[PDB]
Design a protein around this ligand. Structure first.
Ligand code: F43
Ligand SMILES: C[C@@H](OP(=O)(O)O)[C@H](NC(=O)CCCCCCCS)C(=O)O
Ligand SMILES: O=S(=O)(O)CCS
Ligand SMILES: O=S(=O)(O)CCS
Ligand SMILES: [Mg+2]
Ligand SMILES: [Mg+2]
Ligand SMILES: [Mg+2]
Ligand SMILES: [Mg+2]
Ligand SMILES: [Zn+2]
Lengths: 442, 548, 248, 548, 110
């Protein structure tokens, strides 16, 4: 291992799973369950066969409110979904019995598609998933019904929408958790351009798993961006472990202590007490009736501080059962903890700054919207390097129905398909097990 | 009767149209031309005032060794030198683009749901009217909430406003009619019934931001400007806290979740934001043009008004400036809306199809493509052969290829009622043409035309798309003159023959059925003529704020 | 918890507003009905509208965090989320914008607080909003001349005072009566006229404003003279700077 | 002496500026103001003309319960109501943007090597001059090769031209001087020697395309338009075949290999092509402002002229329209260029530094940042506390945060001669300010201010960059008012104290040293005042081609 | 050495830093390799060329197996070299942003 740190790992009910695992066993670079989640998100496509059939029968293709009168085609796609799914799988696979999956859902209305990994190991990126899946379903439908040369371009529009006139698959009846590479705010951002509502949909609104999935995705992106390289690697790994994976049961135990009556302020006081207890901070100087705290390990203070911030969101937004206040928690947990201690807040002010713009862009006329439409690739919320978005995932999971743009509104197709995949839906389980399994190989 | 282009040819040349010989070199060069003479004088005055040489007719080659022709704007009696049809010199052309660029369509369906379900307040036609009075004060740039706001000069932004429409006649009739695009008033009964069935109980805003702002800024400004002032107007009219959590749903709704841009954004080689010409798909351009609701008895007139709309925008402004610039591409476009030439070829094709098949009655297949596109291609090329004046007028091969293939493609789609076979007829026309005369267009003219047959019916990722959905960003079409506006006419063609109220988007169709627009979209060629005569009054000018 | 460094009355006042164990001085009495009127979200006698069903009629799957975090009563019931917003004069109002947000997130549960120069806001579930608002209005968070309840058209924090010592209000929601020396709330916070005005009491006198204010100024206590508070601010700037460069 | 803002405060209010109380509510609302009275009258006329309600002072809340102030344009004796500084109502502000948007710098160095090495032809000052006569005919949109070209009207495009510059004095002397930006004439002797040494024997064109085209189209049009007409002029002036293989080398050179855009393209969320405001880096905006070559004896004047340039462009046109729109962000920007307030604070800091360290002599470290930014922050904040009229004037916390931080940042950079420590001082100012008054700016003001300290000296992929290279697309900066133009000032500040001829690109500096520009970049604030008085004459109007 | 960073013809007067990078290439390349690799025996390659004027870098396949795309190659290499250079000459906090500009250019403004 490059670092000396070990952590205790717990399950989503706050019970010990494995003691003293090397920090790097949770690294995106080493952990096989994180690998499986990333490869899975790369290669998974939700197919809306009912959507395709309705689009074709009405000629409504190419985007909102669009229709081409006279192009209607009435094809019994859902009634024949077994044969179409089987024909598409034959095209999508590389060899018989490889890792290609095609499974009908909702009685043939939806299909889960997992494109084989061998396609991605000779690809630059991830677009082979929607492109191979779209073309195999287009061809399978044409072949099913013997759609003529004259009509088949309508099946293509029904499936993949206005592409390539639009840059995106505008009006498409397939969905992925990734978005197209041209929409990245910077190179290496693709695992950050994943809507908070999609994450919460996939994890069925379970709060810890939503936080775990979100942190895994955000910190895995920090490796792809180069931010977790060299001087900063250990800071990123400790944030993953403590803010996203409930390392040492710290997030759990702060929520437990504050859930009944607590506030953001009471969470801060408990975290500062725990950091001093564990030696992460110490009194450096005494001013008038005010202790100035110091640390010899900023990456560790950051991690503790980040665990407290997640616990503070769980307490504040959990007590409201309303997600909107996450933007306020993200700001004032950090602003409060700085003046409480004399030490810098999470990500050296970057969470607080993210939260200022996120508060503004979730309560003003100029842009943004509700907490669920944000993601780490959004201009408002890209600034903290992995320490803000997982709290938003946690807040949205806790929302009892205060949002118009909720996961039910924006993420139905994703929920039905991606929640089916174990490691997407319960990643805290699989990531911990994988870490325990490789603990003596790190 | 005569071929429709005979009058124009007789106006342009002293010789009869059939005569093969003429006189050159004795016309005095530029001195033959009222317009060139105005430009040489202007050149002199500009250079003397600023101290840097500018327009000078002795630089390079001497223009006007042949006759510098007038052009008839098709369907009009207006004859002008081609410089008066250059977009820089023609305020109608500039305003047509500004009126598209500054428009966005924004639904009120998600907004009204946030009001009822999240704020718990009622929506009625009266609350919608109060909201429309408020947003018509705010949208041009004026304040409703804060103290000590400075504001736009209402006379500078007089062209900005917001109207609404809905498929429900009883709801439409209860909203104050100053604000309502009235579908029953603007559309003939059968088209009104189609459009009202499409919209149903939906309610939609058509928002036009100020032309002065659009010119100072860009197309991507339009949806953001619209949203900020829809947002302030929601705050004011429905009496909400001025910036609370719900305000964000109105922003996300107006900016993303219920917005219809006129054009989608472009990739990096040609980086542009929304509401630029390259993002406007052919079926939307056919729907913006309003010839469909006025000229519906004559599918040729509707389809070639769309061609004029698209050839000017896509070849003159878009390919000839945004994507290139300079002297640019005036006559590559004018070939498609002048001298009644495309009209003559297209009425020939419409008559051929009427007589053999009946409109929309031909089988939708390759036998129909081969039949109709070959016949009409032979008809148009025969005219350049029969009339040397016609060949000297449309002197560039590209010009001829676009016109002949547009008549063949539109005629094919008149037969089949399907744009896809119209498009296959466009490519066949190009192949026949290239063999007939051993030439086609400019060096790079048939890049899309040689890809063209195989991609008409493809279904692959960046190849397969019904023609209505294609546009200036479809890969094969992204570079070249003499195609994009013609494809907009071909997309209109089967719908005009079928008598469909719209080609691709019924909301975009209704959004331009509005006499408060500065440009008149029911008569595009008439407006191009008015601008060429220096009789068009654009919006956006700064006279009020500059020295007398 | 220590909250805030510094040796001025201003620093102590900031600590006090944040400290939930500090009993905020109650300055005036306001009835329930009148707090509801001032808020303007619902009518007297009107039932709390709902945005979602009550929690117990939901039967949501198992979640250890949810199990451990007690919802506020409004959340159980499915209350709308509503707001109250205050503006504070730079001429020595007792509370000020960051002071409020910092204090609200130490004192109150389930709270979405925003700070701006000209207004400060909290949003939370309706019935809980009513109880908090009563404290915000009756205690030394509020002075009826130098603070204003304003859900829109908030201009006034940085303006000269009027001849009565009242802060500017474009909508004049709070009216000083020259014959009585008391201020009355005549409109609710969004500016609609109230059936009957609500007495808000006498403004604080100059010496009591100076005692309670949380703004630093050259004519009160200047921040540059609170050298320990300045030191901590500079410290945080330096530690953030070095941390962003190389984690030292 | 009086603080520099005292005269302005005496003109706005009846009270002496130290007085703490005033009178409200009795000024007659909007009737106190000549300009609002103008707008109420114009809204009634606009609505009646078009049959749709528009501006109406009875919608929303009633403006003018306090004094609606005049503003002094700093460094001038011009006083105007703020509406006159809104970019929509001010033609000098629009023209400032148009002059930048329509400019590109294109090298002749690769071109000249294609001429010698690939074509075997010679290049000389005579061949250069002939080329320059050619391109000055072609660039505004006129023809040099083909017969029957139509052309732009020279008077509509009188503002378009091409000049050259070069560090080689004897070559610059041998090219015709109508086309030459003469570095020896425009810059003082020291700066000229620096700039000539940077350019060496390189020769660069400064190309300005027509304002009318820039307004009709977008910034990404500029380099394409420039390349088309450089391309035609190369063909014509050097007698090459009109479209052969080498022609593609000149296209490639002029479009990509030796072009300097003013702005680089933007990412998809804010999709825009080149030469849009979000793509202009702060160091180029400092170099486009020409205060450096006139006011070099006063580094405060130079830095604050840059702040005025950037505050208007980045906050009013860019953030307040392209990225939002509506009534917009006039006063968030005017705070930085009115009433001599930023000037008073920044001269204080300059005097402080000059006295204690000497300009540029302070150590380049955090001890200097703490000392200078703190002293200057406290000074500024003290003036708002000591002059209640000043506080009521700059009434929004965001305005005061930007002004005070700009004085602190520029002063820190005056001490260290380095922009990066200037930037650390800016952030420190915000944190002090926030603790002093328990407020700072609007709800989302300090997103970048709280990221700020940590990112000043970062080296990570999307965090680390010297300030001169940052711009409106630097991630933390991409959204919010009250920062970008002040950052352009801090970029200028150390260079001004050092007496450097340029901040970031010497080519951009020379390129705007040109009195044939429409806007006078040597006197940005004087030009804003001229536009505010309706005295400035912009290019791009269509009056010549519209009815009387 | 010349402060010419950020694009064609760009320069920041007063920011010049004179560092002997090529003379110390071996040390700098090794320090960069340690950051670029995932483990000691993986397929990371860092090889000096042209007497230390250039380096061939092959970023370990393991990083791409847990990445959406391919930008880890330039971003991981760039940051490893920026950090190796700063560490080689003890470049100050005040100056290090110049090394980042020399290595990766005007990104993220461009
Ligand atoms: C409705 C919002 C929420 C939002 O998203 N934007 C608003 C309103 C918006 C509108 C107001 C125009 C109108 O009145 O119809 C415009 C002009 C943007 C637009 N849509 O064109 C604007 N703000 Ni605002 N906004 C401003 C400011 C401010 C300051 C004003 C504080 C005060 O004491 O008066 C506060 C933020 C703060 O407290 O720091 C503010 C708030 C707000 N701002 C609150 C309304 C406040 C209220 O109810 O009075 N702005 C300023 O601080 C100065 C510049 C000013 C901008 C106009 C200009 O630059 O000329 C205007 C910028
Ligand atoms: C944030 C994003 O908006 P989205 O979330 O994509 O709709 C972005 N809008 C902005 O950043 C607005 C900046 C200017 C107005 C606010 C100034 C402070 S008062 C955008 O339009 O691309
Ligand atoms: O001669 S080319 O075909 O290259 C250009 C036609 S405008
Ligand atoms: O009130 S906000 O800070 O959201 C907007 C200020 S213009
Ligand atoms: Mg335990
Ligand atoms: Mg405790
Ligand atoms: Mg009581
Ligand atoms: Mg002048
Ligand atoms: Zn424009």
């Amino acid at each position: 291992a490059k670092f000396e740190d070990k952590v205790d790992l717990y399950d989503d009910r706050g019970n010990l799973v494995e003691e003293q695992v090397p920090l790097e066993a949770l690294s995106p670079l080493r952990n096989p369950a994180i690998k499986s989640i990333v490869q899975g998100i790369k290669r998974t496509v939700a197919v809306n066969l009912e959507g395709i059939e309705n689009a074709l029968k009405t000629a409504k293709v190419g985007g909102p409110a669009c229709k081409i009168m006279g192009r209607e085609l009435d094809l019994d796609i859902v009634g024949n979904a077994e044969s179409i799914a089987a024909a598409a799988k034959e095209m999508i696979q590389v060899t018989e019995d490889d890792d290609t999956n095609v499974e009908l859902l909702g009685g043939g209305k939806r299909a889960l598609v997992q494109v084989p990994s061998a396609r991605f190991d000779v690809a630059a990126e991830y677009s082979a998933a929607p492109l191979v899946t779209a073309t195999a379903f287009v061809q399978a439908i044409i072949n099913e019904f013997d759609v003529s040369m004259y009509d088949a371009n309508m099946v293509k529009a029904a499936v993949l929408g206005r592409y390539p006139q639009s840059v995106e698959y505008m009006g498409a009846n397939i969905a992925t958790m990734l978005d197209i590479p041209q929409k990245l705010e910077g190179p290496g951002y693709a695992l950050r351009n994943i809507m908070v509502n999609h994450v919460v949909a996939a994890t069925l609104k379970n709060t810890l798993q939503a936080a775990a999935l979100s942190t895994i995705l955000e910190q895995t992106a920090m490796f792809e961006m180069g931010d977790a390289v060299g001087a900063f690697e250990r800071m990123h790994l400790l944030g993953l472990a403590y803010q996203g994976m409930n390392a040492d049961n710290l997030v759990f135990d702060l929520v437990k202590a504050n859930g009944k009556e607590g506030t953001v302020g009471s969470v801060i006081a408990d975290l500062v007490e725990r950091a001093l207890e564990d030696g992460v901070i110490k009194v450096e100087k005494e001013l008038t009736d005010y202790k100035v705290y110091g640390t010899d390990d900023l990456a560790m203070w950051n991690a503790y501080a980040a665990a407290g911030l997640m616990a503070a969101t769980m307490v504040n937004q959990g007590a409201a059962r309303a997600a909107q206040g996450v933007s306020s928690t993200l700001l004032y947990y950090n602003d409060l903890i700085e003046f409480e201690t004399g030490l810098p807040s999470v990500d050296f002010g970057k969470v607080e700054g993210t939260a200022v713009g996120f508060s503004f862009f979730s309560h003003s006329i100029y842009g943004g919207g509700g907490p669920g439409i944000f993601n780490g690739n959004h201009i408002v919320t890209r600034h903290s390097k992995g320490f803000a978005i997982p709290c938003v995932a946690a807040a949205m999971a806790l929302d009892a129905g205060t949002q118009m743009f909720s996961p039910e509104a924006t993420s139905g197709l994703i929920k039905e398909v991606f929640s089916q995949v174990d490691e997407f839906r319960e990643p805290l389980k699989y990531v911990v097990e994988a870490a325990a399994e490789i603990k003596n190989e790190i | 009767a005569d071929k429709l282009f005979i009058n124009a040819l007789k106006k342009k040349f002293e010789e009869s149209p059939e005569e093969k010989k003429t006189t050159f070199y004795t016309l005095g060069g530029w001195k033959q031309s009222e317009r060139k003479t105005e430009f040489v004088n202007a050149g002199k005055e500009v250079a003397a005032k600023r101290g840097i040489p500018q327009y000078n007719p002795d630089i390079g080659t001497p223009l006007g060794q042949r006759v510098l022709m007038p052009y008839q704007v098709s369907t009009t009696d207006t004859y002008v030198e081609g410089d008066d049809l250059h977009f820089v010199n023609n305020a109608a052309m500039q305003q047509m683009w500004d009126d598209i660029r500054r428009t966005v369509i924004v639904g009120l369906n998600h907004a009204h749901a946030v009001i009822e379900k999240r704020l718990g307040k009622e929506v009625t036609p009266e609350t919608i009217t109060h909201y429309l009075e408020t947003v018509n004060h705010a949208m041009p740039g004026a304040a409703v909430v804060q103290e000590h706001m400075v504001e736009t000069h209402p006379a500078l932004v007089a062209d900005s406003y917001v109207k609404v429409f809905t498929g429900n006649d009883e709801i439409a009739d209860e909203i104050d009619p100053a604000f309502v695009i009235d579908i029953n008033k603007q559309f003939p009964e059968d088209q009104a019934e189609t459009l009202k069935a499409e919209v149903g109980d939906g309610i939609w805003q058509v928002v036009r931001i100020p032309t002065i702002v659009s010119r100072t800024c860009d197309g991507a400004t339009t949806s953001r400007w619209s949203a900020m002032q829809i947002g302030m107007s929601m705050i004011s009219a429905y009496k909400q806290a001025a910036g609370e959590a719900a305000t964000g749903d109105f922003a996300y709704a107006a900016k993303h979740a219920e917005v219809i841009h006129m054009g989608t954004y472009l990739p990096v080689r040609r980086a542009r934001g929304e509401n630029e010409p390259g993002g406007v798909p052919f079926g939307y351009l056919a729907d913006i043009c309003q010839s469909s609701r006025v000229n519906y008895e004559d599918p040729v007139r509707v389809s070639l008004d769309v061609v004029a709309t698209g050839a000017m925008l896509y070849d003159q402004i878009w390919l000839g400036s945004y994507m290139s610039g300079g002297v640019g591409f005036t006559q590559y476009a004018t070939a498609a809306y002048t001298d009644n030439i495309l009209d003559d070829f297209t009425y020939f094709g419409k008559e051929y199809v009427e007589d053999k098949y009946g409109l929309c009655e031909a089988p939708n297949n390759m036998d129909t493509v081969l039949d109709v596109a070959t016949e009409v291609t032979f008809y148009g090329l025969e005219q350049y052969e029969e009339y040397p004046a016609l060949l000297e007028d449309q002197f560039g091969g590209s010009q001829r290829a676009a016109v002949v293939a547009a008549a063949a493609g539109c005629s094919t789609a008149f037969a089949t009622g399907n744009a896809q076979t119209g498009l296959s007829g466009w490519y066949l026309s190009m192949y026949l043409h290239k063999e007939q005369h051993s030439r086609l267009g400019f060096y790079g003219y048939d890049l899309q035309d040689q890809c063209g047959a195989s991609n008409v019916f493809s279904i692959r990722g960046d190849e397969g798309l019904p023609l209505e959905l294609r546009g200036p960003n479809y890969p094969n079409y992204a570079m070249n003159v003499g195609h994009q506006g013609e494809y907009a006419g071909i997309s209109q063609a089967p719908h005009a023959a079928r008598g469909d109220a719209f080609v691709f988007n019924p909301l975009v169709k209704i959004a331009f059925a509005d006499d408060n627009l500065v440009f008149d979209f029911t008569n595009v060629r008439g407006e191009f003529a008015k601008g060429a005569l220096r009789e068009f009054e654009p919006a956006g000018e700064r006279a009020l704020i500059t020295p007398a | 918890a220590q909250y805030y460094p510094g040796t001025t009355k201003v620093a102590q006042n900031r600590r006090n507003f944040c400290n939930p164990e500090y009993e905020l001085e109650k300055l005036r009495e306001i009835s329930d009905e009148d707090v509801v009127k001032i808020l303007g979200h619902r009518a007297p006698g009107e039932e709390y509208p709902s945005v979602h069903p009550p929690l117990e009629e939901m039967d949501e799957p198992e979640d250890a965090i949810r199990e451990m975090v007690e919802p506020i009563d409004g959340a159980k019931a499915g209350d709308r989320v509503r707001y109250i917003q205050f503006t504070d004069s730079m001429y020595f109002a007792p509370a000020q914008p960051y002071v409020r947000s910092r204090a609200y997130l130490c004192r109150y549960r389930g709270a979405d607080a925003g700070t701006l120069s000209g207004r400060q806001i909290i949003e939370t579930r309706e019935r809980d909003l009513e109880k908090i608002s009563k404290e915000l209005l009756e205690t030394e968070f509020f002075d009826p001349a130098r603070s204003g309840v304003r859900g829109k058209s908030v201009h006034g924090h940085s303006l000269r005072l009027d001849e009565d010592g009242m802060m500017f209000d474009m909508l004049r929601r709070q009216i000083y009566n020259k014959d009585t020396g008391r201020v009355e709330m005549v409109k609710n916070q969004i500016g609609d006229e109230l059936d009957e005005p609500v007495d808000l009491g006498e403004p604080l006198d100059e010496e009591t404003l100076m005692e309670k204010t949380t703004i630093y100024r050259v004519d009160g206590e200047a921040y540059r003279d609170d050298v320990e508070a300045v030191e901590i601010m500079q410290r945080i700037h330096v530690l953030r700077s070095q941390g962003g460069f190389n984690l030292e």
